[PDB]
Amino acid sequence: SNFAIILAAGKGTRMKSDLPKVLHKVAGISMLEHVFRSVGAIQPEKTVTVVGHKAELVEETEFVTQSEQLGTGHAVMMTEPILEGLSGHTLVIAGDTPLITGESLKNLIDFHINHKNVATILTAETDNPFGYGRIVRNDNAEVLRIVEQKDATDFEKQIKEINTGTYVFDNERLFEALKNINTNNAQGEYYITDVIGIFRETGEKVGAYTLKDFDESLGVNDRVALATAESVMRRRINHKHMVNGVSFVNPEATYIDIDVEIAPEVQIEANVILKGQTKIGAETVLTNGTYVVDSTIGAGAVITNSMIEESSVADGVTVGPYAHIRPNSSLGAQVHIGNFVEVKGSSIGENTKAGHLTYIGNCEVGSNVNFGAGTITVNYDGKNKYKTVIGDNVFVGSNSTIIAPVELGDNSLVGAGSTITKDVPADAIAIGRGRQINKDEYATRLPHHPKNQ
Amino acid sequence: SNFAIILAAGKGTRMKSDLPKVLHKVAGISMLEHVFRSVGAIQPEKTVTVVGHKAELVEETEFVTQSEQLGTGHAVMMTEPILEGLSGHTLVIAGDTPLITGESLKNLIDFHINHKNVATILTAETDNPFGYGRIVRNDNAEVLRIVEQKDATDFEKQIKEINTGTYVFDNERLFEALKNINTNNAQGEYYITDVIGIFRETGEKVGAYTLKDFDESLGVNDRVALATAESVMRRRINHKHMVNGVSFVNPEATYIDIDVEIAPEVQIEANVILKGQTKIGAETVLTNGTYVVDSTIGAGAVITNSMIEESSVADGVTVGPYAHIRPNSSLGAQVHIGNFVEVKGSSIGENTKAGHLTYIGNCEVGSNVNFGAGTITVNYDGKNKYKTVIGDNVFVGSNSTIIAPVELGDNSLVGAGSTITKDVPADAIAIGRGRQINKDEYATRLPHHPKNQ
Amino acid sequence: SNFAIILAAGKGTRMKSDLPKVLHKVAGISMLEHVFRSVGAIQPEKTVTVVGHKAELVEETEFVTQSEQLGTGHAVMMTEPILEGLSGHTLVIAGDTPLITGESLKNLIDFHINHKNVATILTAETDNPFGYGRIVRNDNAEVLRIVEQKDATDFEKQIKEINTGTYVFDNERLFEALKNINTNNAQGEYYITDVIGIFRETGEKVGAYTLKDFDESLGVNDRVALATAESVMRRRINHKHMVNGVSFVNPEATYIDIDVEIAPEVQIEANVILKGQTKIGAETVLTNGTYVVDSTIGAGAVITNSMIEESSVADGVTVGPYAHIRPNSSLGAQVHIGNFVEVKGSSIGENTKAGHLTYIGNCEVGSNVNFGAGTITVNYDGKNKYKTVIGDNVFVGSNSTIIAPVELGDNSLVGAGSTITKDVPADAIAIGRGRQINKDEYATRLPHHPKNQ
C-alpha cells in the first residue's frame, strides 16, 4: 500500500564539501538517516534511495544510481525497475529535509488516501515565498498547479503557500506520466513537478497537505541551513528530555545527540555535550564543559567539566573538574577521579580515589585504593604496552612511578616519590627514592636567594 | 493594610520530581524565594505560605499545611485562622510565578487601593490565550467575570486578556465569600476564582491590572517552563550588570546567580558561571569556562578558564588556564596559579607563583615563593591530614614531594626531583634524589631504539 | 570627490568606563576601527576623526581635538581648517555605529550624487521610534526636515522613519551653514541637524536613503548596546564562514574575531574562541572550549578543548583535551600533545608525542621523541632561564626531571623517575633514581591498613 523514494543525488556545490550533502550530520546522524526515520513512520513495503557521485560512500533501503544530473524526474525514473506496475501510494522526499517528522508524513499519506488523490503535495505557508513554487488553488480551494517563481504572474507571486518538494503519488500513474514527459520532452532534464503539469492536462485529482510549521520543511543546501537544522533538532531533542524530567540551565546551548538516553531528575548545566550511544542514570549532575561519547553513566553521579569516552561509570561516581576518562575504562561504585587525572584502558574498583595529577593506563585496580597526587602508571616501552595489577586497600604514594608489568599486593603502600620496578607483596611497603640531605646556608649561594637580588 | 498569601501546595506531577515544585532553583534560589522577594515590595504585615506533601522540606513567612488537594479555595482557607477578621488588602500569589516583579505587585495593590475594589485580578494580554481564564469587560470596560476556556462562548474565546492567578482581595470579604462557597458548594473542591463569581452575584467591585509583559506571568508546571524562567531571570540579571558597567561577550550564554556582586569595568567572556555569594572586583577579567562559587575576587585579577570555590582571591591575581582553587583557600596579592594546579585549604602569600602541574593542600605559604612544575604537597596518610609551613622566598624544586608535617624555612631551596621527609632550615638547600648514571650504547638494546624497529 | 568626518568625541557616561567609548572592542577591534573600515568603502580623499578627552589614547585618519562639549555642530566645525573650501560629498558618521556596512555608505553617497542633494540623511524604519529624530516628507515624498521627539506633534510622533545621525553634505555649503548657526546661534551648543534646518530656510535640496535593516544603525551608548553589536557582528562573521564551507554546531555561541581566516571544510563545535591573527587550515576540527589567539593551525588537525597562543601548529597535529600551547611554540607535522600538557617557547619536531601531565619549556625537541607522563623540563633557577636540547627518537621516561641546560642525544633513554643534571650521549641510557626496597608486613603498622581501621 505504501512506497518511499528518497532523492539523495541532488547537487551539493554550496556545501563546499568532499562529503556528499545528505551524509552531513545533524545531532549525531546524517540528514539521510533523519529522513529514513521519518519515512519509517509510513511503514513502506519498499524504500528506494537514489544516489549520484560517491554512491559507494553513501551505500557504505534499496539503492539505485543517477550517473547523470538530468533533474528530479530522471532521479525518480531510476526507481522504475523496482516500482513500475505496483499499486499503492508512493512518497517522494529529499534526503536534505531532515526536520520533516514521521507525524507529518503519516498525515500526508492519510490526507492523500482520504481524498483519493492521484498526487498530494506537502506544502507550507511563509510570508517570504520568493524563489519557491507557488500552490495555485480555485474558488473551491482545490490544487490546480505548481507555478515556479520565474513563471509566476505578479498575482501568483502574492501566493504564500509553497511546494516543499515532498509528494505522495498513485504509483501506477507516476511512472506512466514520467515515461510520457521523458519521450515527448524535446529536452534532456525533467522534474517531478512536470508530473503535476500532466495531471492538470488530464484533470486527474491533485491535493496539498500544509505543514503547520514552515521551518520543518527546510531543505539544506549550505552550512548556514545545516546549522539551522542543528538548532531545530537540538531544540526538539532537549524539549523531549525536559518534558521527561531533565533540568537544563540552557537548552538552547546544550548539545545532546538524537539517541542519547537521559533518566528523569538529571540536571544539565549549559554547554554539556552528550554524543552517540550515551546513557545517563537518575539524579546525575553534568556540569558546564562535560563531554560524554558512547558511555554509560550511573545514578547519583556528578561529572564536573570532564571528558568521558567509550567507558562505563557506576552509581555515585565523582569525576572532575578537568578529568579525562579514555576508551575501555570502567569506574566502579563511588569512585572519585579528581582534577588533571587521565584513566585509559583500566578497571577501577569501588570507592577507589585518584584525586590529582595522575595517569592510570592498562591497570586492573581493586577497591578502596588511594592514588597519591602525581602517580604515574608507566605502561609503554616505545613498542609494547604492559599491564599493572593493583590489589584492594593499596596506598600508592604521591609522585610514584609504577613501571609495568608489576603487581601491588593487597594493603601495600608505595612510598611517595618512589620508582617501582618490581612486584610489592601484600601488606609490604616499597620505597625507591633518595634520602633527604640538608646543607646549611647553601641557599645563600643560589640565584633565587634575596641576598643575590 | 497589606497581607500576602503564597500558594505553594499546588500539583507538581509534570516536574517528575521528588523535590517539591516551588523549591526548584532559578538563577541560584528557589522559585518560592523569588516570590518572597517580589511579595516583600508590598511590605506585608503578615505573609502566609500554604504547603502540601513534603511540607517539612519546604519549611526546612508563616506556614500552614494543605493535607488534601481540594483546590486553591481550600488552600486560601488554610490561612483563615491567621487572617480572618483583619482589614486591608490581601495579595494571593502562586509560588510558581517567580518572574513577577516587586514593581508589578506594588502597581497591583496601588491600582486596587486606587479603585476601592473588593477584588483586583493581575491580568496580561497574549495572542494565544488557549487554556487560560478570560477577563470579561463591558462597554465601560469594567471587569464583569473570569470565564475558563471550557465555559467560554466562541466570542469569549476571542478575549486575549487572561487571568495570571495573582489577586488582591479586601481581606474581610475574601474569608466571608470562601465560607459561603465551602458550605453551599454541593462539592469537595473550590477555587479562588469562585470568589470572583460571588462578587458578580452581589455587584461588588472587581478590577484588573494588566502586566505590560505577558512573559512575566509564567507559571512553571514543568522543566520546559523552568528553563524559560531561567532564560528570563538570566537576561534580567545580566542586563542590570551591563547597565552597571560590566561587559559581556554574550549575555544570553553567561550564567550569573541572582545575588552575585560585580564591580563596574569587569569583562566577562561567554560561558562564565558565577554562583552563590560571589563578589568580583573592578576591572577583573573572567574568561570562557570560569566557574566561581561563594568566592571573593579582587580588582585587576584575570581568571582564565578556572574553577574557584569558597575561597578569597586578592587584587592582581592570575589563575589558569585549567586551575582548581578548592574550598578554604586564600590567594594573596599578585599570586600566579598556572595550568593544572590545585590549591586546597591553603593560604598563599603575595607574589607567590605556582605555574604548573602542582598540588598545594593544607599548606601555609609565605610571600615570593616559587613552586616548580610537578610539586606535590603530601598531606594525607590514609587516616589523618598534616600541615606544611613554607616560609618567604622559598624555591620548591620541580617534581618534589613534600611529605607533611614539615617546615621549609625562609629562602630555602628544595632540589628538583627531591622527596622531603624532614624540616629544611632557613637559607639551607635540601636534596633527596638519585645521582645520574650514564650507560654508553645501552639504548641500542631497548625497544624504543630505531635499530630495534 | 568624497570626504569623511568621524565623530569620536561624543559623551560616554553610560559606559561607566575609563576607556573612551569608541575604543571598546566588538569581535576583536574597536568600534572606531569598524567605522574606519565601512568609511574606506567610499574611497575618501580625506578622513578627519574628531576626538575629545583622552585624545592621546585614541590617537595612540587625520585627527582634530574637541576640548569642549558644544555639540556635533562644534565637533564638525573642528574639521573646518582641513575641509573648508573643498568641493565634493562629505560623509558625517559617528564612531559608535560599528554595524553600518561599506555597502550602506556606498549606497548613501551614490543616492546623494544621484539626486544632486545638498544634504542626504541615512534613515531607517522602526515600529518604536520613541526618542529618535523623525524624517518629515511631503505628498511627493521629498525630505522637508528632521523633527526631534521633544518638538514632534502627535501626528509627527507616528513617523517611523528616523535619523541614524549619519549624513552626506555638499562640503562647501556644510561649512558655510555651520559658521552661520555658530555666529547667529544666541547659544553655546550647536548640532549637525541645525544645518538641515538652514537648508529648509533656503529650499536647498535634502534627501534620505533608508537602511533596509534598522538594527544596522545601532548607536552604542552602554554595555547593553555593546553586547547587541557583538551579537550582530558575531552572526555576520559566522555567516560568512558558513557560506565559505565552515560547519558550526552553534554559530550563535561561537566567538570568532573579525580578521580570523578559516579554510573550507573546517568543523567548529559550539563555544570555540578564535582571536586576533588566527588562521585555521582545511578539514581541521576545533572542539568545544578551544581558545586560539594569534596562531596558525594547519590542515587535518584536531584541537580538543585546548588553549593555543602566539604559536604555529603544523598539519595533522592533535592537541588536548586540556592542553596549553603558550607563546613562541611550534608543533611539527603529526605531533600529539595530550591532556594536562603545557608547551612554552619550544620547537617540537614531527611525530613527537607528549601525551600527559608534562611541561616543555625553552626546549628544542627533535622528531619521533616520546615524553613519558609526568616529565618536567626545569628551565628556571629563580633569575635566569636555560635551554634544553632533545635529539631525534629520544625516550624521556615518565616522571623525569630534566634540569637545563642539558642535551639528550639522539636515540637516548632517560629512566622513568630520573633527575637529569648532565648531558646524555646519543644511544646512552641515563638513570638517576633510588633502587626499590621492599619491607615485608610493614604496611600492617601504617594508618591506611585495614587492620588499623
Ligand SMILES: CC(=O)SCCNC(=O)CCNC(=O)[C@H](O)C(C)(C)COP(=O)(O)OP(=O)(O)OC[C@H]1O[C@@H](n2cnc3c(N)ncnc32)[C@H](O)[C@@H]1OP(=O)(O)O
Ligand atoms: C598529595 C596526596 O595525594 S596526599 C596522599 C598520598 N600520601 C602519601 O604519598 C604518603 C606516603 N608516605 C610515605 O611515603 C612515608 O614516607 C612512609 C609512610 C613511606 C614513611 O614511613 P615511616 O615508617 O615513617 O618511614 P621510616 O623512615 O620509619 O622508614 C621505614 C623503613 O623504610 C626504610 N627507608 C626509609 N627511607 C628509605 C629510602 N629512601 N630507601 C630505602 N629505605 C628507606 C627505613 O630504613 C625503614 O626500614 P628499617 O625499619 O628496616 O630500618
Ligand SMILES: CC(=O)SCCNC(=O)CCNC(=O)[C@H](O)C(C)(C)COP(=O)(O)OP(=O)(O)OC[C@H]1O[C@@H](n2cnc3c(N)ncnc32)[C@H](O)[C@@H]1OP(=O)(O)O
Ligand atoms: C619547570 C619549572 O617550574 S622551572 C623552576 C623550578 N626550578 C628548579 O626546580 C631548579 C632546582 N635546581 C636544582 O635542583 C639544582 O640541581 C640544585 C640547585 C639542587 C643544584 O645545585 P648545585 O649547587 O649546582 O649542585 P651541586 O652538584 O654543586 O651540589 C650541591 C651540594 O649538594 C650535594 N648533592 C648534589 N646532588 C646530590 C644528591 N643527589 N644527593 C645528596 N647530595 C647531593 C653535593 O655533594 C653538594 O654538597 P657538598 O658541597 O657538601 O659536596
Ligand SMILES: CC(=O)SCCNC(=O)CCNC(=O)[C@H](O)C(C)(C)COP(=O)(O)OP(=O)(O)OC[C@H]1O[C@@H](n2cnc3c(N)ncnc32)[C@H](O)[C@@H]1OP(=O)(O)O
Ligand atoms: C606513562 C607513560 O607515558 S608510558 C611511557 C614512558 N615509559 C617509560 O618511562 C619507561 C622507562 N623505562 C625505564 O625507566 C626502565 O626502568 C629502564 C628501561 C630504565 C629499565 O631498563 P633495564 O635495562 O631493564 O634495567 P636494568 O635493571 O637491566 O638496568 C640497566 C643498567 O642500569 C643500572 N641501574 C638500574 N637501576 C639503577 C639506578 N636506580 N641507579 C643507577 N643505576 C641503575 C643497572 O645496574 C644496569 O647497569 P649494568 O648493566 O652496568 O649493571
Ligand SMILES: [Ca+2]
Ligand atoms: Ca530543496
Ligand SMILES: [Ca+2]
Ligand atoms: Ca611528578
Ligand SMILES: [Ca+2]
Ligand atoms: Ca498556573
Ligand SMILES: [Ca+2]
Ligand atoms: Ca547616537
Ligand SMILES: [Zn+2]
Ligand atoms: Zn579523549
Ligand SMILES: [Zn+2]
Ligand atoms: Zn571544586
Ligand SMILES: [Zn+2]
Ligand atoms: Zn595561555
